[PDB]
Symmetry: C2
Subunit: 182 residues, 2 copies
């Protein structure tokens, strides 16, 4: 099924990178390799769709825990940071794959913009405090990559030192905030 292949592609891309074979992915999904291509016509297609599926999963937990009572930009961003830190901690495979898929040459401009416009409110809540350079078409991926690099580092230190996780998350957040916001 389409769902069993996206899950195998998630784990494979997280462990082996974007160079994961489609022969490994369908095999790790219980279907033959031909079924993979009858759902995802090309390697690049599965790359782009899984990005859309992973970003949809990630933001749906971003906005799910977001307090709509909050109106201050920084406090609101602290909510989204804590949710993203928690999502990666609760879903280590999806976070690793969404990292390697956001980086890649293979993501088309249509998938990149649709990943932002899929949740328009959260986009404006996740972008309208940024350095304007990081919302440009040419540096938006890089801006997402600095954020995710800082978040991953925050995840690792926290899971490996739970007593201090509360401080890693706060320090990581302020560091991210000075790095990317205006």
């Amino acid at each position: 099924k389409k769902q069993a292949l996206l899950e195998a592609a998630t784990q494979a891309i997280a462990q082996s990178g974007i160079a994961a074979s489609t022969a490994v992915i369908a095999r790790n999904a219980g279907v033959a390799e031909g079924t993979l291509f009858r759902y995802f016509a090309t390697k690049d297609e599965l790359i782009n769709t899984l990005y859309l599926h992973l970003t949809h999963d990630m933001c749906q937990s971003l906005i799910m825990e977001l307090d709509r009572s909050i109106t201050d930009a920084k406090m609101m961003t602290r909510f989204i940071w804590n949710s993203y830190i928690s999502w990666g901690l609760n879903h280590p495979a999806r976070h690793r794959a969404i990292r390697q898929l956001a980086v890649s040459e293979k993501l088309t401009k249509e998938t990149r913009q649709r990943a932002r416009d899929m949740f328009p409110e959260l986009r404006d809540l996740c972008y309208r405090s940024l350095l304007m350079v990081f919302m440009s078409d040419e540096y938006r991926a890089f801006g997402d990559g600095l954020f995710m690099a800082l978040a991953e580092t925050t995840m690792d230190f926290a899971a490996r030192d739970p007593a201090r996780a509360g401080e890693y998350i706060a320090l990581g957040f302020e560091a991210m905030w000075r790095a990317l916001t205006r």
Copy 2:
């Protein structure tokens, strides 16, 4: 010699993480695991010695390129940033290996203290501008990991989009400077 094991360790920890087995390291170097254990009594000893050797290779490349006439603290830091990014693009396995080793649990803090004190002038150069949080005993490793996560993203984008390399290095540097310095 040991160099084959140290190099195999670099490639393997950069690929399969600190979780990489002693057997493949030894095997990808064409030496017996026993011999690996004849030179490194534990996997922990291997990981602490490797971190020392890898930090020495990186720090000396940093000081090999310094200009002793750069007396501005921020400009001097930008030179060191340029060196580190350059060192990471020329040796992506050594750089990828240094990030996982530095954030791992099994690295004794006598080891990483010895890593910073083998180049004391470099140590005080790159740490003189840092916030107190990131010079603390508890959050020093966290500061190095945030720096390295930002540099790694900078290297990844500069290598894959070289038409825009200069912007990534500059934006990466300024992002890092806001995140970690007073």
